[PDB]
Structure formats: C-alpha cells, structure tokens
PDB file of C-alpha atoms and ligand atoms in Angstrom:
ATOM      1  CA  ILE A  18     -42.882  30.994 -62.968  1.00 26.06           C
ATOM      2  CA  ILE A  19     -46.354  30.162 -61.734  1.00 27.44           C
ATOM      3  CA  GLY A  20     -48.300  28.741 -64.587  1.00 27.69           C
ATOM      4  CA  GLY A  21     -47.187  29.496 -68.103  1.00 25.46           C
ATOM      5  CA  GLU A  22     -45.422  26.869 -70.280  1.00 24.87           C
ATOM      6  CA  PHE A  23     -42.090  24.971 -70.281  1.00 26.28           C
ATOM      7  CA  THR A  24     -39.857  26.198 -73.047  1.00 26.69           C
ATOM      8  CA  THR A  25     -36.330  25.756 -74.619  1.00 30.74           C
ATOM      9  CA  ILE A  26     -33.191  28.031 -74.618  1.00 31.70           C
ATOM     10  CA  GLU A  27     -33.721  28.424 -78.407  1.00 32.40           C
ATOM     11  CA  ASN A  28     -36.968  30.513 -77.622  1.00 34.45           C
ATOM     12  CA  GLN A  29     -35.022  32.611 -75.093  1.00 30.15           C
ATOM     13  CA  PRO A  30     -31.403  32.815 -76.552  1.00 30.23           C
ATOM     14  CA  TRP A  31     -30.485  35.775 -74.395  1.00 30.75           C
ATOM     15  CA  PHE A  32     -31.225  34.035 -71.106  1.00 32.82           C
ATOM     16  CA  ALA A  33     -28.333  33.519 -68.707  1.00 32.01           C
ATOM     17  CA  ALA A  34     -28.489  30.962 -65.751  1.00 30.39           C
ATOM     18  CA  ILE A  35     -26.365  32.216 -62.836  1.00 33.44           C
ATOM     19  CA  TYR A  36     -24.990  29.648 -60.170  1.00 33.57           C
ATOM     20  CA  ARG A  37     -22.823  29.907 -57.080  1.00 33.89           C
ATOM     21  CA  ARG A  38     -20.005  27.531 -56.148  1.00 33.99           C
ATOM     22  CA  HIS A  39     -19.905  25.906 -52.759  1.00 33.78           C
ATOM     23  CA  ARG A  40     -17.293  24.386 -50.460  1.00 33.93           C
ATOM     24  CA  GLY A  41     -17.254  20.642 -51.375  1.00 29.49           C
ATOM     25  CA  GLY A  42     -18.547  20.943 -55.089  1.00 29.18           C
ATOM     26  CA  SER A  43     -22.176  21.547 -54.647  1.00 28.31           C
ATOM     27  CA  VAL A  44     -23.410  24.199 -57.039  1.00 28.51           C
ATOM     28  CA  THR A  45     -26.752  25.981 -56.615  1.00 29.81           C
ATOM     29  CA  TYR A  46     -28.865  28.163 -58.824  1.00 30.16           C
ATOM     30  CA  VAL A  47     -28.893  31.786 -57.774  1.00 33.85           C
ATOM     31  CA  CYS A  48     -30.718  34.025 -60.255  1.00 34.25           C
ATOM     32  CA  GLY A  49     -31.504  34.538 -63.910  1.00 35.09           C
ATOM     33  CA  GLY A  50     -29.825  37.187 -66.202  1.00 35.32           C
ATOM     34  CA  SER A  51     -29.609  38.580 -69.869  1.00 33.67           C
ATOM     35  CA  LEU A  52     -26.910  38.863 -72.374  1.00 34.28           C
ATOM     36  CA  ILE A  53     -26.837  42.435 -73.421  1.00 33.56           C
ATOM     37  CA  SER A  54     -23.481  42.079 -75.279  1.00 36.90           C
ATOM     38  CA  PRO A  55     -20.869  39.129 -75.851  1.00 39.26           C
ATOM     39  CA  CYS A  56     -19.070  40.125 -72.754  1.00 41.03           C
ATOM     40  CA  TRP A  57     -21.881  41.408 -70.516  1.00 39.71           C
ATOM     41  CA  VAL A  58     -24.864  39.929 -68.698  1.00 39.95           C
ATOM     42  CA  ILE A  59     -27.184  42.126 -66.856  1.00 38.17           C
ATOM     43  CA  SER A  60     -29.044  40.906 -63.608  1.00 38.12           C
ATOM     44  CA  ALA A  61     -30.102  42.212 -60.183  1.00 33.88           C
ATOM     45  CA  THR A  62     -27.816  43.393 -57.385  1.00 34.36           C
ATOM     46  CA  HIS A  63     -29.933  41.682 -54.558  1.00 33.68           C
ATOM     47  CA  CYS A  64     -28.853  38.319 -56.018  1.00 34.34           C
ATOM     48  CA  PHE A  65     -25.120  39.023 -55.011  1.00 33.88           C
ATOM     49  CA  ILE A  66     -25.142  41.685 -52.481  1.00 33.42           C
ATOM     50  CA  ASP A  67     -24.621  39.115 -49.552  1.00 36.77           C
ATOM     51  CA  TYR A  68     -21.638  37.386 -51.428  1.00 40.16           C
ATOM     52  CA  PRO A  69     -19.804  39.890 -53.677  1.00 37.89           C
ATOM     53  CA  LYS A  70     -17.178  37.297 -54.600  1.00 37.54           C
ATOM     54  CA  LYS A  71     -16.984  37.208 -58.234  1.00 35.88           C
ATOM     55  CA  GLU A  72     -14.857  34.019 -58.218  1.00 37.47           C
ATOM     56  CA  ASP A  73     -17.750  32.148 -56.618  1.00 38.35           C
ATOM     57  CA  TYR A  74     -20.078  32.547 -59.575  1.00 38.52           C
ATOM     58  CA  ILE A  75     -20.729  30.405 -62.703  1.00 38.74           C
ATOM     59  CA  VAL A  76     -22.639  31.843 -65.564  1.00 38.37           C
ATOM     60  CA  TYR A  77     -24.237  29.583 -68.271  1.00 37.51           C
ATOM     61  CA  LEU A  78     -25.463  30.567 -71.735  1.00 36.72           C
ATOM     62  CA  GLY A  79     -27.510  28.222 -73.945  1.00 37.06           C
ATOM     63  CA  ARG A  80     -28.840  26.132 -71.233  1.00 37.89           C
ATOM     64  CA  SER A  81     -32.353  24.841 -71.192  1.00 39.18           C
ATOM     65  CA  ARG A  82     -32.175  22.686 -67.943  1.00 37.29           C
ATOM     66  CA  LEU A  83     -31.339  23.364 -64.305  1.00 35.70           C
ATOM     67  CA  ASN A  84     -29.140  20.412 -63.347  1.00 34.86           C
ATOM     68  CA  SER A  85     -28.385  18.964 -66.711  1.00 34.89           C
ATOM     69  CA  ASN A  86     -26.143  19.910 -69.615  1.00 36.03           C
ATOM     70  CA  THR A  87     -27.680  21.101 -72.964  1.00 37.61           C
ATOM     71  CA  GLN A  88     -25.915  20.781 -76.357  1.00 40.38           C
ATOM     72  CA  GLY A  89     -24.340  23.925 -77.491  1.00 37.97           C
ATOM     73  CA  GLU A  90     -24.320  25.473 -73.862  1.00 38.91           C
ATOM     74  CA  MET A  91     -21.295  27.570 -72.820  1.00 39.58           C
ATOM     75  CA  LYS A  92     -19.859  28.052 -69.208  1.00 38.42           C
ATOM     76  CA  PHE A  93     -18.356  31.342 -68.101  1.00 35.61           C
ATOM     77  CA  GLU A  94     -16.520  32.697 -65.075  1.00 39.93           C
ATOM     78  CA  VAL A  95     -17.244  36.391 -63.948  1.00 40.36           C
ATOM     79  CA  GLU A  96     -14.373  38.655 -64.514  1.00 41.01           C
ATOM     80  CA  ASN A  97     -15.992  41.563 -63.020  1.00 39.88           C
ATOM     81  CA  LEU A  98     -19.108  42.082 -60.797  1.00 38.69           C
ATOM     82  CA  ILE A  99     -20.504  45.400 -60.815  1.00 43.03           C
ATOM     83  CA  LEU A 100     -23.297  46.016 -58.273  1.00 41.42           C
ATOM     84  CA  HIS A 101     -25.159  49.424 -58.023  1.00 41.56           C
ATOM     85  CA  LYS A 102     -23.864  51.698 -55.297  1.00 43.57           C
ATOM     86  CA  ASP A 103     -27.163  53.038 -54.063  1.00 43.56           C
ATOM     87  CA  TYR A 104     -28.863  49.635 -53.851  1.00 44.17           C
ATOM     88  CA  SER A 105     -31.084  49.304 -50.695  1.00 48.48           C
ATOM     89  CA  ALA A 106     -33.946  47.077 -49.642  1.00 46.51           C
ATOM     90  CA  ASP A 107     -37.036  48.077 -47.658  1.00 46.61           C
ATOM     91  CA  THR A 108     -39.793  45.859 -46.239  1.00 47.49           C
ATOM     92  CA  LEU A 109     -40.783  44.535 -49.778  1.00 48.03           C
ATOM     93  CA  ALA A 110     -39.181  46.976 -52.230  1.00 45.37           C
ATOM     94  CA  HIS A 111     -35.709  46.721 -53.589  1.00 44.46           C
ATOM     95  CA  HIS A 112     -34.108  50.000 -54.916  1.00 38.18           C
ATOM     96  CA  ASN A 113     -31.579  50.279 -57.755  1.00 41.52           C
ATOM     97  CA  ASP A 114     -31.733  46.532 -58.162  1.00 39.80           C
ATOM     98  CA  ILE A 115     -29.375  46.201 -61.234  1.00 39.80           C
ATOM     99  CA  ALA A 116     -26.061  44.463 -61.635  1.00 39.40           C
ATOM    100  CA  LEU A 117     -23.520  43.888 -64.411  1.00 40.69           C
ATOM    101  CA  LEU A 118     -21.578  40.797 -64.817  1.00 39.66           C
ATOM    102  CA  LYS A 119     -18.711  40.789 -67.151  1.00 33.21           C
ATOM    103  CA  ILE A 120     -18.006  37.201 -68.385  1.00 32.10           C
ATOM    104  CA  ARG A 121     -15.023  35.224 -69.801  1.00 33.22           C
ATOM    105  CA  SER A 122     -14.495  31.580 -70.772  1.00 32.21           C
ATOM    106  CA  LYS A 123     -11.500  29.659 -69.520  1.00 30.63           C
ATOM    107  CA  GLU A 124      -9.893  30.633 -72.701  1.00 28.32           C
ATOM    108  CA  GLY A 125     -10.589  34.279 -71.991  1.00 30.02           C
ATOM    109  CA  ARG A 126     -13.186  34.683 -74.736  1.00 30.41           C
ATOM    110  CA  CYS A 127     -16.725  36.174 -74.456  1.00 32.58           C
ATOM    111  CA  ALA A 128     -19.881  34.684 -75.780  1.00 30.73           C
ATOM    112  CA  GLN A 129     -20.083  33.596 -79.350  1.00 27.70           C
ATOM    113  CA  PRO A 130     -23.641  33.925 -80.843  1.00 25.30           C
ATOM    114  CA  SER A 131     -25.319  30.817 -82.088  1.00 24.01           C
ATOM    115  CA  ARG A 132     -28.904  29.616 -82.313  1.00 24.54           C
ATOM    116  CA  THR A 133     -29.084  29.188 -78.567  1.00 25.37           C
ATOM    117  CA  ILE A 134     -27.074  32.123 -77.671  1.00 27.27           C
ATOM    118  CA  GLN A 135     -28.041  35.743 -78.729  1.00 22.98           C
ATOM    119  CA  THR A 136     -28.055  39.283 -77.126  1.00 27.58           C
ATOM    120  CA  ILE A 137     -31.067  41.347 -76.295  1.00 25.13           C
ATOM    121  CA  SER A 138     -31.530  45.210 -77.354  1.00 22.67           C
ATOM    122  CA  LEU A 139     -31.535  47.711 -74.438  1.00 25.00           C
ATOM    123  CA  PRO A 140     -34.385  50.298 -74.586  1.00 26.17           C
ATOM    124  CA  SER A 141     -33.848  54.020 -75.807  1.00 26.04           C
ATOM    125  CA  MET A 142     -33.489  56.781 -73.231  1.00 26.36           C
ATOM    126  CA  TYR A 143     -36.955  57.037 -71.650  1.00 26.62           C
ATOM    127  CA  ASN A 144     -38.902  54.982 -74.283  1.00 26.99           C
ATOM    128  CA  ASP A 145     -40.975  52.257 -72.691  1.00 27.58           C
ATOM    129  CA  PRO A 146     -43.943  50.332 -74.091  1.00 27.37           C
ATOM    130  CA  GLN A 147     -47.380  51.754 -73.322  1.00 30.81           C
ATOM    131  CA  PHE A 148     -49.065  50.288 -70.335  1.00 32.59           C
ATOM    132  CA  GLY A 149     -51.469  47.362 -71.208  1.00 36.21           C
ATOM    133  CA  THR A 150     -48.661  45.878 -73.499  1.00 37.57           C
ATOM    134  CA  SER A 151     -47.992  42.173 -73.290  1.00 39.31           C
ATOM    135  CA  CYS A 152     -44.475  41.087 -72.403  1.00 37.17           C
ATOM    136  CA  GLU A 153     -42.759  37.764 -71.491  1.00 37.59           C
ATOM    137  CA  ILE A 154     -40.680  36.665 -68.714  1.00 39.87           C
ATOM    138  CA  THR A 155     -38.462  33.689 -68.212  1.00 44.30           C
ATOM    139  CA  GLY A 156     -36.799  31.711 -65.486  1.00 41.91           C
ATOM    140  CA  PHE A 157     -36.018  28.493 -63.476  1.00 38.68           C
ATOM    141  CA  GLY A 158     -38.061  29.784 -60.496  1.00 38.94           C
ATOM    142  CA  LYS A 159     -40.745  28.300 -58.408  1.00 39.73           C
ATOM    143  CA  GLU A 160     -43.898  26.858 -60.045  1.00 40.41           C
ATOM    144  CA  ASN A 161     -45.935  27.271 -56.746  1.00 40.12           C
ATOM    145  CA  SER A 162     -45.262  29.074 -53.490  1.00 40.01           C
ATOM    146  CA  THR A 163     -45.478  25.783 -51.661  1.00 39.77           C
ATOM    147  CA  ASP A 164     -42.373  24.198 -53.593  1.00 39.71           C
ATOM    148  CA  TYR A 165     -38.971  24.040 -52.030  1.00 38.61           C
ATOM    149  CA  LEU A 166     -37.302  22.871 -55.317  1.00 38.45           C
ATOM    150  CA  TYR A 167     -36.968  24.590 -58.708  1.00 40.58           C
ATOM    151  CA  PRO A 168     -38.274  23.205 -61.839  1.00 40.29           C
ATOM    152  CA  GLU A 169     -35.832  21.104 -63.959  1.00 37.48           C
ATOM    153  CA  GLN A 170     -36.900  22.721 -67.271  1.00 38.63           C
ATOM    154  CA  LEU A 171     -36.947  26.347 -68.137  1.00 37.31           C
ATOM    155  CA  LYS A 172     -40.280  28.148 -68.266  1.00 36.38           C
ATOM    156  CA  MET A 173     -41.851  31.335 -69.585  1.00 36.44           C
ATOM    157  CA  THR A 174     -45.108  33.275 -69.378  1.00 37.95           C
ATOM    158  CA  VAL A 175     -46.861  36.352 -70.743  1.00 36.43           C
ATOM    159  CA  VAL A 176     -47.918  39.247 -68.385  1.00 37.45           C
ATOM    160  CA  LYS A 177     -49.245  42.812 -69.036  1.00 35.38           C
ATOM    161  CA  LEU A 178     -47.602  46.028 -68.026  1.00 34.50           C
ATOM    162  CA  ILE A 179     -49.437  48.023 -65.326  1.00 33.90           C
ATOM    163  CA  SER A 180     -49.354  51.793 -65.066  1.00 34.63           C
ATOM    164  CA  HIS A 181     -47.447  53.453 -62.106  1.00 33.60           C
ATOM    165  CA  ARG A 182     -50.759  54.980 -61.113  1.00 36.03           C
ATOM    166  CA  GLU A 183     -52.518  51.542 -60.729  1.00 41.18           C
ATOM    167  CA  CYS A 184     -49.504  50.080 -59.006  1.00 38.59           C
ATOM    168  CA  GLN A 185     -49.388  52.893 -56.483  1.00 38.58           C
ATOM    169  CA  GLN A 186     -53.029  52.217 -55.360  1.00 39.13           C
ATOM    170  CA  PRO A 187     -53.324  51.444 -51.539  1.00 39.66           C
ATOM    171  CA  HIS A 188     -54.430  47.861 -52.159  1.00 39.35           C
ATOM    172  CA  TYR A 189     -51.333  47.244 -54.563  1.00 37.72           C
ATOM    173  CA  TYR A 190     -48.030  48.617 -53.290  1.00 39.09           C
ATOM    174  CA  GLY A 191     -48.935  52.324 -52.633  1.00 35.80           C
ATOM    175  CA  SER A 192     -45.854  54.647 -52.497  1.00 37.39           C
ATOM    176  CA  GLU A 193     -43.459  51.729 -52.190  1.00 39.49           C
ATOM    177  CA  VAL A 194     -43.179  51.427 -56.043  1.00 39.96           C
ATOM    178  CA  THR A 195     -41.396  54.302 -57.751  1.00 41.24           C
ATOM    179  CA  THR A 196     -40.846  55.692 -61.292  1.00 44.22           C
ATOM    180  CA  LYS A 197     -37.538  53.605 -61.499  1.00 40.96           C
ATOM    181  CA  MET A 198     -39.714  50.457 -61.299  1.00 42.84           C
ATOM    182  CA  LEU A 199     -42.218  48.860 -63.512  1.00 45.01           C
ATOM    183  CA  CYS A 200     -45.225  46.693 -62.634  1.00 49.78           C
ATOM    184  CA  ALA A 201     -46.524  43.591 -64.639  1.00 50.69           C
ATOM    185  CA  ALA A 202     -49.168  40.936 -63.926  1.00 53.03           C
ATOM    186  CA  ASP A 203     -51.635  38.665 -65.521  1.00 50.80           C
ATOM    187  CA  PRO A 204     -55.175  40.484 -65.520  1.00 52.05           C
ATOM    188  CA  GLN A 205     -56.567  37.102 -64.024  1.00 49.53           C
ATOM    189  CA  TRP A 206     -53.728  36.839 -61.376  1.00 49.75           C
ATOM    190  CA  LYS A 207     -52.995  33.212 -62.608  1.00 48.55           C
ATOM    191  CA  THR A 208     -49.347  33.354 -63.932  1.00 43.87           C
ATOM    192  CA  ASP A 209     -46.485  35.265 -62.583  1.00 42.54           C
ATOM    193  CA  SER A 210     -42.777  35.420 -61.715  1.00 40.69           C
ATOM    194  CA  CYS A 211     -41.664  33.910 -58.344  1.00 40.60           C
ATOM    195  CA  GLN A 212     -38.704  33.229 -56.055  1.00 40.11           C
ATOM    196  CA  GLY A 213     -35.890  32.027 -58.216  1.00 43.14           C
ATOM    197  CA  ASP A 214     -36.903  34.208 -61.313  1.00 43.84           C
ATOM    198  CA  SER A 215     -35.149  37.256 -60.027  1.00 41.84           C
ATOM    199  CA  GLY A 216     -32.624  38.828 -62.163  1.00 42.01           C
ATOM    200  CA  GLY A 217     -34.298  37.311 -65.189  1.00 43.35           C
ATOM    201  CA  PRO A 218     -35.680  39.405 -68.132  1.00 46.91           C
ATOM    202  CA  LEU A 219     -39.037  41.201 -68.824  1.00 45.57           C
ATOM    203  CA  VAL A 220     -39.011  41.282 -72.709  1.00 46.13           C
ATOM    204  CA  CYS A 221     -41.434  43.422 -74.676  1.00 48.36           C
ATOM    205  CA  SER A 222     -41.945  43.895 -78.279  1.00 48.01           C
ATOM    206  CA  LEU A 223     -41.037  47.443 -78.733  1.00 46.12           C
ATOM    207  CA  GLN A 224     -41.562  48.881 -82.239  1.00 45.50           C
ATOM    208  CA  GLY A 225     -41.097  45.637 -83.856  1.00 46.21           C
ATOM    209  CA  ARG A 226     -38.066  44.626 -81.717  1.00 45.55           C
ATOM    210  CA  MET A 227     -37.418  42.315 -78.585  1.00 43.96           C
ATOM    211  CA  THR A 228     -36.289  44.919 -75.968  1.00 44.67           C
ATOM    212  CA  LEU A 229     -34.966  44.319 -72.450  1.00 43.23           C
ATOM    213  CA  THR A 230     -37.585  46.459 -70.668  1.00 47.25           C
ATOM    214  CA  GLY A 231     -37.258  45.047 -66.968  1.00 48.56           C
ATOM    215  CA  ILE A 232     -35.454  42.955 -64.653  1.00 49.57           C
ATOM    216  CA  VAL A 233     -37.428  40.714 -62.214  1.00 50.89           C
ATOM    217  CA  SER A 234     -36.899  42.409 -58.854  1.00 49.00           C
ATOM    218  CA  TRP A 235     -39.679  41.873 -56.238  1.00 50.09           C
ATOM    219  CA  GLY A 236     -43.262  41.065 -55.275  1.00 51.35           C
ATOM    220  CA  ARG A 237     -45.502  40.162 -52.380  1.00 52.30           C
ATOM    221  CA  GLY A 238     -45.777  36.415 -52.834  1.00 51.83           C
ATOM    222  CA  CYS A 239     -46.445  34.912 -56.242  1.00 51.13           C
ATOM    223  CA  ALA A 240     -49.529  35.377 -58.439  1.00 53.41           C
ATOM    224  CA  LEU A 241     -51.402  36.995 -55.566  1.00 52.80           C
ATOM    225  CA  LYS A 242     -54.369  39.098 -56.491  1.00 52.16           C
ATOM    226  CA  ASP A 243     -53.520  42.814 -56.602  1.00 53.55           C
ATOM    227  CA  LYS A 244     -49.796  41.986 -56.032  1.00 54.77           C
ATOM    228  CA  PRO A 245     -48.036  42.550 -59.372  1.00 57.40           C
ATOM    229  CA  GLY A 246     -44.557  41.618 -60.066  1.00 55.59           C
ATOM    230  CA  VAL A 247     -42.112  44.501 -59.768  1.00 55.57           C
ATOM    231  CA  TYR A 248     -39.279  45.046 -62.299  1.00 55.07           C
ATOM    232  CA  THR A 249     -36.249  47.313 -62.417  1.00 53.99           C
ATOM    233  CA  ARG A 250     -37.002  49.897 -65.101  1.00 50.75           C
ATOM    234  CA  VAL A 251     -33.962  49.381 -67.539  1.00 53.56           C
ATOM    235  CA  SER A 252     -34.693  52.597 -69.470  1.00 54.48           C
ATOM    236  CA  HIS A 253     -33.817  54.799 -66.336  1.00 55.29           C
ATOM    237  CA  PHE A 254     -30.467  53.160 -65.959  1.00 56.09           C
ATOM    238  CA  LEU A 255     -28.895  53.658 -69.282  1.00 52.77           C
ATOM    239  CA  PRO A 256     -26.384  56.208 -68.156  1.00 52.28           C
ATOM    240  CA  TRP A 257     -25.192  53.744 -65.455  1.00 54.30           C
ATOM    241  CA  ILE A 258     -25.097  50.908 -67.912  1.00 56.49           C
ATOM    242  CA  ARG A 259     -23.018  52.704 -70.359  1.00 54.66           C
ATOM    243  CA  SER A 260     -20.561  54.221 -67.896  1.00 55.29           C
ATOM    244  CA  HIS A 261     -19.816  50.851 -66.280  1.00 52.97           C
ATOM    245  CA  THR A 262     -19.494  48.743 -69.541  1.00 51.25           C
TER     246      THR A 262
HETATM  247  N1  AMR B  11     -45.168  38.456 -57.769  1.00 48.62           N
HETATM  248  C1  AMR B  11     -43.815  38.339 -58.084  1.00 48.62           C
HETATM  249  N2  AMR B  11     -43.628  38.696 -59.433  1.00 48.62           N
HETATM  250  N3  AMR B  11     -43.016  38.052 -57.292  1.00 48.62           N
HETATM  251  C2  AMR B  11     -41.654  38.046 -57.498  1.00 48.62           C
HETATM  252  O1  AMR B  11     -40.978  38.375 -58.578  1.00 48.62           O
HETATM  253  C3  AMR B  11     -40.675  37.418 -56.281  1.00 48.62           C
HETATM  254  N4  AMR B  11     -41.296  36.903 -55.284  1.00 48.62           N
HETATM  255  C4  AMR B  11     -40.541  36.390 -54.287  1.00 48.62           C
HETATM  256 CL1  AMR B  11     -41.492  35.681 -52.940  1.00 48.62          CL
HETATM  257  C5  AMR B  11     -39.257  36.513 -54.209  1.00 48.62           C
HETATM  258  N5  AMR B  11     -38.455  35.786 -53.163  1.00 48.62           N
HETATM  259  N6  AMR B  11     -38.524  36.937 -55.266  1.00 48.62           N
HETATM  260  C6  AMR B  11     -39.267  37.541 -56.323  1.00 48.62           C
HETATM  261  N7  AMR B  11     -38.668  38.148 -57.448  1.00 48.62           N
END
C-alpha cells in the first residue's frame, strides 16, 4: 500500500496472510486474502498459478505483522486449493483472477471467530456500490515502487470506485478492463495498492454493511496518474463461489 496508514488486525479481522513454504525452512509472503466463511479464504488465482501445490502454503488469520507473531493469531494448512479454470493473463490484465482456499488447522478445525478473526459478507447478485463510493484496501504490499522489502506492519488506505467508462478511456486502460473487473483509485493519485497487496480485499460499506466488493488483481505500476488499481468483481463470480464451496 502506497501512502495510507499502519493499522492492526483488529481493524481488518477478515484479513488473511498467505505464505509459501520453501526448502530449508524459509517462509515467504505470497499474497493477501479474505475469510468469507470459517473454512474458506478467497484470494486471487495469479498468486498460486505457478505453484499449485496446496501443501506448500500456510494461511495466517489474526496476524498484524509480517515476520512476527501476534497474540490470538491462528495458523492453517490448505485442505483444497481451487483455482479458476478460465484464468489467463495478458500484457497487464489478469482474467478470472479469483481463487478459493479451504483451510484447516492441525487439529482439523476451521476458523473460530474472535476480536481479531471475523468473516466478511459477499455481495448480492449484480449489486455493487455506485461509482464514486469510497472503499478500503488492506495489505502487506510495497510502500514505494523502489522498495524490495515489504512493510513489517499491516497497512490500509481508502480509494474511490471508478466507473467502467472512465477506466476504459485510452489514457487509462482502454478495452483491457472488462465488466468482470472494477477500477479504484485516489482522485489525487497519492495512495494505492501495490505489488504484494494482490489477493487482498477491496471492502465497501454497502447499505450499512461491510462487503467484499473486490480482490486486488492488477495495475500499471503503483499510484501512477491515470493508472487505477484493478480488482476482480466479486459480484459477477457468485455462481462460481457457491458451486465450489
Ligand atoms: N495500481 C495498482 N493498484 N497496482 C496493483 O494493484 C499491482 N501492481 C503491481 Cl506492480 C503488481 N505486481 N501487482 C499489483 N496487484
């Protein structure tokens, strides 16, 4: 997250930190995710497409820091890694960038709700917030394009939803963005999601209710003028989400 502020997991209880195990014992951060139900985490397919091995992933819930433990956090293995069949990636754009991760603890149990661990509501069929609506994003992603390391503390920022028409302009993304995607950015181009924030949530207060409106998917650079963040439109994937869960 470029700009924005440091926050704690208590403020983003549905946030899931996904790591990959390596040979030797070195674990590295992969992407963000969201707890949609006690046993299910939703993320982006591009995060796992190159290494589809469920055994190599570790999902953390209730975690505020990247490389240190947080009181009340819970560790989970991945029981089932469901990637979208029609996933494809063009020059910039990622299509059908959505993934489901069925989680289970060592004891075979799912997530147990607490002050630092909660689920987020999915949207209604084709019912998104009107454009111009403010939404928040969270992640352990880069703070600047020039950084090679990720921030140690979780961050968040607020961005505004941009209409499909505006995002399809020539100077923006043109015909690369589709109706299955959502654009969002800071009107002043100061804050934005970046590398590392992928798979994380785009949360919008819809009709007095926190709703998972999008999943961080792609963008040209980070916080660049006329280059909004692009998110997977959760409302258009409800049939797919329900059929696999
Ligand atoms: N402007 C944005 N919102 N950009 C990104 O979200 C993003 N950028 C880069 Cl450079 C990347 N590797 N992954 C991303 N998800």
